[PDB]
Structures are given as structure tokens and as C-alpha cells.
Amino acid sequence: AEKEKNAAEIRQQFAMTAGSPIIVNDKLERYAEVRTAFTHPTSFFKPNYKGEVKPWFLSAYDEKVRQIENGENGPKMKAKNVGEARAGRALEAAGWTLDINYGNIYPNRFFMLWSGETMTNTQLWAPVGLDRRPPDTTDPVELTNYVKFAARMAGADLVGVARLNRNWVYSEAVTIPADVPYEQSLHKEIEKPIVFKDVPLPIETDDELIIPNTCENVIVAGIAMNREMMQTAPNSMACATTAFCYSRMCMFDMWLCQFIRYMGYYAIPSCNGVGQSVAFAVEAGLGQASRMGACITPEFGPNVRLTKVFTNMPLVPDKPIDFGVTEFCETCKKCARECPSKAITEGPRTFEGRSIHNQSGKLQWQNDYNKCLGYWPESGGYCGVCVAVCPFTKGNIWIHDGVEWLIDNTRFLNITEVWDGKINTYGLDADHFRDTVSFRKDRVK
Amino acid sequence: AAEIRQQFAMTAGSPIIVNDKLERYAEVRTAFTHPTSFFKPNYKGEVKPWFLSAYDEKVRQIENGENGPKMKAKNVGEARAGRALEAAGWTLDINYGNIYPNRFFMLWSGETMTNTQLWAPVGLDRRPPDTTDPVELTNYVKFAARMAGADLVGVARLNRNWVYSEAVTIPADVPYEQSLHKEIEKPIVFKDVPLPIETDDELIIPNTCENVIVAGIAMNREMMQTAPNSMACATTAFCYSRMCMFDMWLCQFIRYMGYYAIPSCNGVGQSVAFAVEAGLGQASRMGACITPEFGPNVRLTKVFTNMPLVPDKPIDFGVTEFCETCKKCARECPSKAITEGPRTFEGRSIHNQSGKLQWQNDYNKCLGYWPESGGYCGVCVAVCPFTKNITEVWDGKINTYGLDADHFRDTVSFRKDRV
Ligand SMILES: Oc1c(Br)cc(Br)cc1Br
Numbered sequence: 001a002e003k004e005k006n007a008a009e010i011r012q013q014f015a016m017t018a019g020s021p022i023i024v025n026d027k028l029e030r031y032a033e034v035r036t037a038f039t040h041p042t043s044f045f046k047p048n049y050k051g052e053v054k055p056w057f058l059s060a061y062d063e064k065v066r067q068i069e070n071g072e073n074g075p076k077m078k079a080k081n082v083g084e085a086r087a088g089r090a091l092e093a094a095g096w097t098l099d100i101n102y103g104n105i106y107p108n109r110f111f112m113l114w115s116g117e118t119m120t121n122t123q124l125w126a127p128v129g130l131d132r133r134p135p136d137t138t139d140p141v142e143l144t145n146y147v148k149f150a151a152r153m154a155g156a157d158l159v160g161v162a163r164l165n166r167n168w169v170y171s172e173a174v175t176i177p178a179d180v181p182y183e184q185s186l187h188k189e190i191e192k193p194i195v196f197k198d199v200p201l202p203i204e205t206d207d208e209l210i211i212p213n214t215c216e217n218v219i220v221a222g223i224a225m226n227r228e229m230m231q232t233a234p235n236s237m238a239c240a241t242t243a244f245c246y247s248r249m250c251m252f253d254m255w256l257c258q259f260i261r262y263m264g265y266y267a268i269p270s271c272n273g274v275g276q277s278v279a280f281a282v283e284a285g286l287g288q289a290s291r292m293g294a295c296i297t298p299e300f301g302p303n304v305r306l307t308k309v310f311t312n313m314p315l316v317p318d319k320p321i322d323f324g325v326t327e328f329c330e331t332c333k334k335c336a337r338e339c340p341s342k343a344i345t346e347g348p349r350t351f352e353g354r355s356i357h358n359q360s361g362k363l364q365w366q367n368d369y370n371k372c373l374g375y376w377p378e379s380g381g382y383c384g385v386c387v388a389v390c391p392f393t394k395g396n397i398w399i400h401d402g403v404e405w406l407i408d409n410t411r412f413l414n415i416t417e418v419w420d421g422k423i424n425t426y427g428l429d430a431d432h433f434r435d436t437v438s439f440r441k442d443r444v445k
Numbered sequence: 446a447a448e449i450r451q452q453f454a455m456t457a458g459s460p461i462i463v464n465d466k467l468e469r470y471a472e473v474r475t476a477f478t479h480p481t482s483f484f485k486p487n488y489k490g491e492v493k494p495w496f497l498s499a500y501d502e503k504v505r506q507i508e509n510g511e512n513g514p515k516m517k518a519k520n521v522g523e524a525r526a527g528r529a530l531e532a533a534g535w536t537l538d539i540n541y542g543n544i545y546p547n548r549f550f551m552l553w554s555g556e557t558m559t560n561t562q563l564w565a566p567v568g569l570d571r572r573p574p575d576t577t578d579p580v581e582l583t584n585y586v587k588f589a590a591r592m593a594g595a596d597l598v599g600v601a602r603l604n605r606n607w608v609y610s611e612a613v614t615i616p617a618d619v620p621y622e623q624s625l626h627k628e629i630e631k632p633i634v635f636k637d638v639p640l641p642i643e644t645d646d647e648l649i650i651p652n653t654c655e656n657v658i659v660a661g662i663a664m665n666r667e668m669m670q671t672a673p674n675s676m677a678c679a680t681t682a683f684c685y686s687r688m689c690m691f692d693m694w695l696c697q698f699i700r701y702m703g704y705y706a707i708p709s710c711n712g713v714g715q716s717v718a719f720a721v722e723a724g725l726g727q728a729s730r731m732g733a734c735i736t737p738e739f740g741p742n743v744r745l746t747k748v749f750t751n752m753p754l755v756p757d758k759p760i761d762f763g764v765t766e767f768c769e770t771c772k773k774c775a776r777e778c779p780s781k782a783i784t785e786g787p788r789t790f791e792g793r794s795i796h797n798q799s800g801k802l803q804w805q806n807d808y809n810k811c812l813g814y815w816p817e818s819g820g821y822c823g824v825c826v827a828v829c830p831f832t833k834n835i836t837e838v839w840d841g842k843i844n845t846y847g848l849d850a851d852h853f854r855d856t857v858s859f860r861k862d863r864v
């Protein structure tokens with residue numbers, strides 16, 4: 001008989017011994033956030049469909065408008081009618097409600113405050129003194145169970161803990177001056193160093209973002225996207241599950257940081273800022289790095305968003321996991337073949353970056369992310385075809401042979417229906433939601 | 446569960462029975478806000494705003510290693526953690542309930558929001574609707590509501606009887622730090638205007654505001670069963686922040702479809718009445734809307750809109766007749782707030798709206814138990830048949846947002862059940 005899927009068993013079977021799994025060499029240096037394709041001047045500008053050169057997201061806007069007027073849900077993809085085209089873009093736009101300028105990357109601005117002191121919730125609760133009272137728990141074992149329970153309340157589908165590896169913290173962040181209002185933010189972005197110093201609390205000066213040397217740990221959350229919507233990549237409904245999950249990321253960071261602060265510790269939110277989420281997720285055991293560059297998880301494949309919170313709270317690091325992703329990516333190459341921009345390499349991993357957008361000195365598949373971003377104005381969305389076609393995104397990959405779990409090798413050989421089809425709360429799927437149930441035994445050992 | 450809800454559909458028409466005495470209810474009359482109920486003593490005998498006295502009890506319990514009134518925790522650390530989780534849950538909620546209309550998160554226009562400004566070049570909020578068919582719109586908006594975190598969603602025509610006659614709010618330029626000390630009353634009126642608008646004198650809802658969308662936000666069963674202790678407070682608090690995100694997400698979606706949308710959370714009007722008229726559940730002895738999926742262990746929020754929609758049918762699965770003989774909430778209520786008598790049209794005090802047939806409860810007695818216990822009680826929700834220690838909760842089953850995979854299939858949705 002078919003053995004019922006056991007996600008906790010799978011993670012236990014593939015757990016590794018302690019140690020960062022990312023292989024590095026001597027040319028590794030911390031990476032300035034401005035180098036990402038979203039922000040770097042060499043990649044930031046893209047043509048629109050009339051050949052006008054604009055910030056990439058404005059060119060993409062032009063294409064969304066064109067598609068709605070032409071009754072399309074994506075590039076050369078006709079919608080049922082204009083109203084359906086409109087509805088997909090309204091859903092996408094609404095999804096971003098709790099996210100600043102596509103990713104919340106500015107540290108200690110807007111939702112990403114490094115201290116709780118000025119938040120309305122902190123002010124309302126001030127008479128209890130939870131953020132001023134010294135911790136009543138210092139045991140990392142109990143703290144890990146408490147904070148993971150809170151993380152699940154706060155919307156994480158996956159949660160893991162690692163020691164903080166500063167290699168993946170950006171050398172300089174992209175941010176805005178503290179006196180700049182929102183409406184000018186996109187015109188006034190600057191860089192600011194992230195430094196580690198002997199100070200009691202995270203603090204920002206005119207010159208630096210200062211993380212305490214006591215900031216020992218990073219908590220990484222996975223925020224699951226919706227399978228049916230992502231499978232419409234590169235069309236509008238894939239954009240909408242992406243967007244909603246960014247607002248879920250923001251809520252998660254704020255909720256969890258407040259919990260940690262009210263336990264007597266400090267906490268730094270990040271969403272897409274501060275450091276490289278994929279590396280932290282790999283070191284925290286959520287999954288493995290992949291050819292496409294994302295963290296592939298046993299539960300969701302790469303079809304999951306990541307955020308993270310940095311803290312001095314004592315915690316028990318999780319073990320990394322190796323369920324064979326590297327070996328499957330070595331022979332699969334479906335994302336590379338299906339990529340509309342040919343951004344993903346079909347070659348071997350190297351330590352040598354393809355361009356300014358890659359951090360050299362770590363063994364990975366090196367992809368051309370200027371090519372990827374170039375397809376976003378062309379398609380009017382955030383693509384996601386590589387996530388959509390990856391066999392690990394399928395809900396159906398795990399089989400049990402009577403002794404142990406294994407990956408089914410056979411897996412590697414329209415939008416109207418989405419709007420009319422299955423949905424559940426937050427786009428989660430009840431046919432798989434059991435996979436993320438959690439008891440103390442799987443939160444801390 | 447889609448089977449059950451169709452089986453128990455009523456014919457159209459509001460199931461709340463009213464008489465000629467009914468009048469719209471001023472929000473200040475709630476026990477949370479009214480001057481006769483607002484001040485309560487703490488355990489030292491000092492009279493304070495009720496929530497400040499409740500704070501004093503939370504501090505006393507943490508110092509004493511307790512998770513609730515005369516409920517010892519495993520240790521002080523566990524006591525601290527439950528209150529830290531509770532406090533954190535409220536992060537996206539202003540002053541317990543987001544009730545001030547058109548302030549903070551509850552803006553009646555999207556024009557100033559950061560998301561609207563970022564998306565302004567696309568012009569979704571200025572473009573006329575491309576869809577006016579109420580059938581397609583009902584399908585679209587319910588799909589969006591599920592993306593936005595509703596576990597249940599229903600649509601009703603807007604019954605103005607349940608809209609507060611006057612809201613509790615603050616002047617628009619008052620900073621948060623002074624909000625609690627500068628609350629005022631402000632009329633909510635309906636006029637022939639194009640868009641929801643606020644003047645110095647009035648909150649103005651357009652006469653075109655035809656519909657209300659009601660969302661159910663499920664609480665966690667294991668945590669609510671710890672009522673009146675701290676983990677029941679935590680699931681309450683997290684769901685309030687889920688309510689706020691739902692309102693903003695859904696209002697933005699409706700605006701980007703070419704319509705207007707008014708968020709509300711605990712403000713603007715009476716959620717239980719809207720939820721009953723929208724078919725989420727039935728009114729009960731304790732006063733809550735009892736749902737088939739969650740019983741009363743579910744929070745409510747609602748959004749008002751001129752978007753054309755198909756109203757859902759009210760549901761009757763026997764709650765009134767069961768509450769007639771049950772009385773379990775009334776017997777377990779630590780404050781004797783819930784009546785054991787029959788339903789009437791006459792409120793027991795200023796806190797009830799007279800003129801509608803309901804079980805009349807003494808809500809000042811309920812609120813009085815909150816500073817005593819240091820929480821939001823919830824014992825009535827916990828003991829209700831329709832709903833079915835703290836160390837075991839922290840060490841036990843949890844899942845994303847506190848939802849339960851053993852029951853999550855009950856809220857799966859296809860177009861057939863959306864419209
Ligand atoms: O990660 C993303 C960012 Br940052 C911006 C936009 Br637009 C889309 C995605 Br996906």
C-alpha cells in the first residue's frame with residue numbers, strides 16, 4: 001500500500017552534519033547590493049515596446065497597459081476578454097500593498113525598522129514593558145521552539161535557523177536618506193555600508209548601518225506561492241502569487257521581530273534587503289541551491305519565497321539538507337532550455353561570476369541576470385518560467401520504496417480556468433498543507 | 446462543506462427580525478468606549494482605562510509565573526512568552542480593532558497609499574471598470590478574498606440598520622501618540638456623492654454603496670481552548686492583524702478594478718449582523734456569528750463597495766433551536782454576562798441595540814472580567830459545541846497562520862461555490 005507522505009521523515013532522512021554547505025574560495029568578498037540587476041546602472045534601464053529607454057519597471061508598466069487594452073494576460077497570450085486581462089493586473093497590483101518599491105530593501109525605513117520603539121504597536125503596549133524587561137528565557141532549546149511556533153503563526157510555511165554568515169550580508173545596502181519622503185524615494189536612493197561593531201543594539205548613523213557583533217543568528221522563513229497561479233508563468237497570475245507573497249513576507253518580518261523584541265532580544269527584519277536570502281536558506285536547511293539559482297525545498301521546490309530576520313536571541317541552528325538537488329540539476333537543465341531569455345547556464349558550476357550581478361568566490365551555477373531582467377519589460381511581468389517548469393515545483397515528486405524516500409525520476413523526463421478553479425486561504429493547497437504541520441520534535445531536537 | 450452550505454441555504458431576505466423601534470447605534474455605546482464602562486480598577490484598586498488595568502494584571506502574572514488568573518505557568522519564561530506572542534500579534538492593528546474610519550490602515554481612498562503611488566503609471570485605479578457583470582465580479586472578488594486571507598467570504602446587500610450612526614475616531618491631524626486621549630464622535634451619513642469622502646463634520650458613504658463583503662478569519666482551536674489564558678489572547682491578536690491585511694488587500698483589488706471600497710475591521714458597523722445577512726453563519730446565544738466550519742471561533746471583517754455583486758443566501762443549520770436548549774456558554778461565563786433567558790427586542794443596557802430579536806447580554810459584565818483575568822477571555826467561544834495546558838500548546842501541533850490541515854479542505858473553493 002502507498003505510504004502516506006511524511007515531510008518530517010523526508011527532512012530527517014536527508015539531514016547533513018553541521019557546516020555551511022556552500023563551497024567558497026579566496027576571491028570571495030561581500031557583495032554590494034547596488035550590483036543586483038534591479039538596481040545597477042548597467043541593467044536598470046530597459047527599452048519598452050516602443051523602443052523608449054526607461055527604468056525597467058516603467059517599461060514593464062507600459063507592457064501591462066498594452067496587454068489590458070489588447071485583452072491579453074501575457075505576451076501574445078490572449079485573455080478571455082479585456083475584463084479578465086484587467087482583473088489579473090488588479091490582483092497583481094493589490095498583492096504588493098504591504099511592500100515598498102518592490103522588495104522592501106531599504107533597511108530601517110518604512111516597514112523594515114531595526115528598532116521597535118516608534119511602532120504604533122510598541123507604543124500601545126509600552127506599559128507592560130515587554131521590550132524593556134530582560135529575557136526570562138536564555139535556553140536556546142526553549143527559545144528555538146518558541147520562536148518557530150511564533151514564525152508559523154506569523155505566516156511562515158517553512159522556518160529554519162542558522163548561525164549568521166557575514167559573507168552573505170551585503171557590504172553596502174541600497175537605501176534612502178532618513179529625511180526623504182516616500183514620493184521621492186525612487187529618485188533619492190543611495191548606498192550605505194553595513195558594518196559590524198561592538199554596540200548593544202542595531203543602530204543607524206548618518207554614515208553606517210551598524211549590526212552588533214552579538215548578532216549571532218538568522219531565522220529564515222519560506223512563504224509558499226500558489227502552484228496553479230505560478231504555472232501560468234510568464235503571464236499575469238504568476239505575477240499575482242509573487243506579489244501577495246511579498247506582502248506576506250513583510251507581515252512575517254514585523255510580527256516575528258516584535259515577538260523577539262517582546263522576549264527581551266533585538267531583531268532586524270530584511271525581506272529582500274540586507275543579505276542574500278538563498279544562501280541563508282541553504283545554511284538554515286530549508287533546501288539546496290539549484291541551477292536556476294533559487295533554493296529548492298522538498299515541500300515546494302523553488303516555488304516558495306524567502307525572508308529572514310537577524311537576532312542575538314540564543315537559538316539552536318538547524319542542520320543543512322542534501323536530498324540530491326545538485327545531482328538532479330547536473331542532468332536536468334529544463335529551466336535553462338525553457339528560459340525565454342537564455343539567462344540560465346547549461347554548463348558546470350564555477351567560482352567565477354558571469355558578470356557584475358554575480359558574487360564571485362562561491363561554487364554555483366552562474367547565470368546572466370541582466371538577460372533575465374530584460375525579459376520582464378518584454379513580458380510585462382516577473383516571468384517565473386524557470387520556477388514553473390522545474391520538476392521540484394510539482395506536488396508529486398516523492399515516493400517511498402518500502403525502506404526510504406526517493407525522488408521519482410519520471411518527473412525529469414489557461415488563466416480563465418485558474419480564476420474558475422481551486423483556491424483556498426492565502427492560496428495554500430489543502431491537498432498538501434499537511435506537509436507543513438509541526439510538533440515540538442521537528443522544531444528543536 | 447460546500448455540500449452542507451447549499452443544503453442549509455434559506456430563501457433570500459434578511460433573517461434578523463426587527464420592530465419599528467430599531468434605530469442605528471452610536472459606536473461610542475460599546476463597552477470598550479462608553480464612559481460608564483471604560484474605567485475599571487486594577488488588582489491594586491487603582492481605577493484606570495480598562496486596558497491599562499488589564500496590562501497591570503499581565504505584568505503581575507508574568508512576575509508570578511502565571512499564564513492566566515490563578516493558572517500557574519511552567520515557569521516565568523513560559524508566562525513571558527505567551528504575553529510576548531499576544532503583544533506581537535497586534536502589530537498591524539491600531540488601538541485594538543482599527544475602528545477609526547479613514548485613519549491609519551483604514552483609508553477610504555487608496556490615493557495616498559505607497560502601493561497606489563508606485564502603481565500610478567498603470568492607472569488601474571483611474572480606469573473605468575472593464576467588468577460590470579455581477580456574476581463575474583463575484584467570482585473575481587471572492588477569489589481575491591481567499592488570496593487575501595479569508596477562510597470564509599460572503600456578500601450581502603448593505604443594510605444601513607447595522608452601520609453605526611456615529612463613529613469613534615480622531616481628528617485627522619492628531620498624531621498616534623495622542624490618539625487615545627483625543628477620540629471623538631463623528632456621524633456616518635449617506636449622500637448622493639461620487640466617492641466615499643470625509644469632511645470636517647461627516648463621514649460620507651455614497652448612496653451607490655450597495656454591497657458589503659464579509660470575511661471570516663479562522664482562529665486556532667488549540668489556543669482558543671486555553672481561554673481565558675494568554676494563548677487565547679494570542680490567536681485573537683494575530684487574527685486582528687490578518688483582518689487588517691485582508692481589508693487593505695481587498696480594497697486595493699476593488700479599486701484597481703475601477704470601483705471604490707471602504708475597509709473597516711471592527712469599525713463602521715456591526716460585523717455579526719453583516720455576517721448573518723451574508724450567509725456566513727447564524728446568530729447565537731453568546732452573541733457571535735456561529736459558522737458551520739468553525740462555530741464562533743472565527744473573526745469577522747468587512748468591506749463596503751459599489752462593485753456589482755450577487756448576494757449570497759442566508760443559511761439556517763439549526764443554531765437558534767440548539768442555542769434554545771444548550772446554555773453552556775451562559776453557565777461557564779465567568780462574569781455571568783450571557784443570558785439564560787429567551788430572545789427579546791429590548792436591550793439590557795446602553796451597550797445593546799434595541800429593536801432586533803436577539804439574546805440580550807450584559808457586555809459591561811463581560812468587559813469587567815478582562816482586567817481581572819488579564820486577557821480577552823473567550824471562554825464562551827471555547828466551550829461552544831459548534832467550536833469543536835499551555836505547555837502542551839507550545840509543544841504541540843501548529844501550522845501556517847494557525848490553520849489546521851485536518852480541516853483546511855473544508856474551505857477549498859471552486860467557481861461553483863463562489864457564485
Ligand atoms: O523580486 C521582485 C522585485 Br524586487 C520586483 C518586482 Br517588480 C518583481 C519581483 Br518577483
Ligand SMILES: Oc1c(Br)cc(Br)cc1Br
Nearest residue numbers: 477496541542681711821
Ligand atoms: O476585540 C478586542 C478589542 Br477591540 C480589544 C482587545 Br484588548 C481585545 C479584543 Br478580543
Ligand code: SF4
Nearest residue numbers: 291329332333335390
Ligand atoms: S529545472 Fe531542473 S536543472 Fe533547473 S533548477 Fe529545476 S531540477 Fe535544477
Ligand code: SF4
Nearest residue numbers: 339372383384385386
Ligand atoms: S525568471 Fe524567466 S527570464 Fe528569468 S531566469 Fe527564470 S525563466 Fe529565465
Ligand code: SF4
Nearest residue numbers: 778811822823824825
Ligand atoms: S468573553 Fe468571557 S466574560 Fe465575556 S461573555 Fe464570553 S465567557 Fe463571558
Ligand code: SF4
Nearest residue numbers: 730768771772774829
Ligand atoms: S454554547 Fe450553546 S447556547 Fe452558547 S452559543 Fe454555543 S450552542 Fe449556543
